Design a protein around this nucleic acid. Structure first.
Ligand SMILES: [Mg+2]
Length: 137
RNA sequence: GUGAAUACGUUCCCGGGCCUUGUACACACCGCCCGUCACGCCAUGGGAGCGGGCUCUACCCGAAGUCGCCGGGAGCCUACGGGC
């Protein structure tokens, strides 16, 4: 009874963890499986993460990509069993949670609102490489 | 066979001839010619609007690119002053 919410978690065997961390205000790419008509592809889709809707298992994130002169957005679930690889590319300062203004105001004016959150860079650059020596010995 | 009147004269009506005049007339005034209207054809201006081409003013976004800066709380060659 008093486990009412543990029940769902128990139902969460479909849980992954090789996902690297990130937070709204930075760009990233995924790699996805699409029924490519006859077969299936690894559709590398790189963009900016916009929104993050957290709810334990069914936590979703929305990625936006400007392709061929068209502002697109793409919504993915975190534990989706379709993410082969997924690797960040850059990180940036937040100042706000969501950011439904990159919709309207998409240009170079976002190359100055993003800015390089170099703090987490060193953080990423730390365990990425300096901890490799903590494997090869 | 017998056997008259008057023309003073050309002002005026008619015909013809000649001179001059005019013309747009010339199978020659039964001529020539004008404009509306009616019919068909032809381009055409105006004209509620329709379709394009070109140019200009202002503002927004802005690929590749040279040039000025930072090149730093990283990447990298180090030729460790530096260069990508
Ligand atoms: Mg006309």
């Amino acid at each position: 009874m008093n486990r009412g919410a543990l029940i769902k978690l128990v139902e969460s065997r479909y849980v992954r963890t090789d996902l690297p961390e990130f937070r709204p205000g930075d760009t990233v790419r995924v790699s996805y499986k699409v029924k490519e008509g006859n077969r299936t592809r690894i559709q590398d889709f790189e963009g900016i993460v916009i929104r993050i809707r957290r709810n334990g298992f069914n936590t979703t994130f929305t990625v936006r990509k400007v392709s061929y002169g068209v502002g697109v957005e793409r919504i993915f679930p975190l534990h989706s069993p379709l993410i082969q690889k997924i690797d960040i590319v850059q990180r940036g300062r937040a100042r706000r949670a969501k950011l439904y203004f990159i919709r309207n105001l998409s240009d170079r004016e976002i190359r100055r609102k993003l800015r390089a959150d170099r703090k987490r860079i060193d953080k990423d650059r730390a365990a990425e490489r300096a901890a490799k020596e903590e494997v090869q010995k």
